[PDB]
């Protein structure tokens, strides 16, 4: 028996030609990046930064 | 003076390889008989 608006999934259809990769960075690492990019001791990458 | 070693003569021969894996049997088409009617 199957009811309307059912919370339980009947089947799962997923496609993967790209795949999202969820990656967790600790916030103190982002904060020391924001402290070091403002000073001249670490220059921003630019064109290669997204890879 | 020269030593005396023991050889095996290894020859190429085909092998298969299969691995056991756990798991649980489920029924083919189970129907959870559940009503569509309120009553006694």
Give how far B20 is from chain A: nearest CA, Å. 28
Closest of A6, A19, A29 to residue B32, by C-alpha: A6
Give how far A6 is from chain B: nearest CA, Å. 14
- Identify the closest residue of chain B to A1 by CA–CA distance: B34
Chain A window 1-30: which residues touch B at a Cβ cutoff of 8 Å?
1
Contact by Cβ (8 Å): A2, B36 = no
CA torsion angle A27 A31 A34 A37 (round to 10): -100
DSSP symbol at B29: S
Nearest-angstrom CA–CA distance, A30 and A34? 6
B-chain residues near A10 (CB < 8 A):
none
**Contact with chain A for residue B29, Cβ under 8 A:** no
Quick one: three-class SS letters along chain A?
CCCCCCCCCCCCCCCCCCCCCCCCCCHHHHHHHHHHHHCCCCCCCCCCCCC
Nearest-angstrom CA–CA distance, A47 and B19? 48
To one decimal place, what's the resolution in Å?
Answer: 3.6
Nearest-angstrom CA–CA distance, B27 and A2? 19
């Amino acid at each position: 028996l199957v009811t309307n608006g059912q919370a339980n999934a009947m089947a799962t259809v997923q496609q993967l030609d790209p795949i999202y990769v969820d990656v967790t960075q600790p916030s103190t690492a982002l904060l020391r990046l924001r402290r070091e990019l403002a000073s001249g001791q670490l220059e921003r990458a630019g064109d290669n930064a997204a890879k | 003076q020269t030593p005396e070693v023991g050889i095996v003569t290894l020859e190429a021969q085909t092998v298969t390889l299969n691995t056991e894996l756990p798991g649980r049997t489920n029924a083919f088409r189970i129907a959870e008989v559940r009503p569509q009617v309120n009553g006694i």
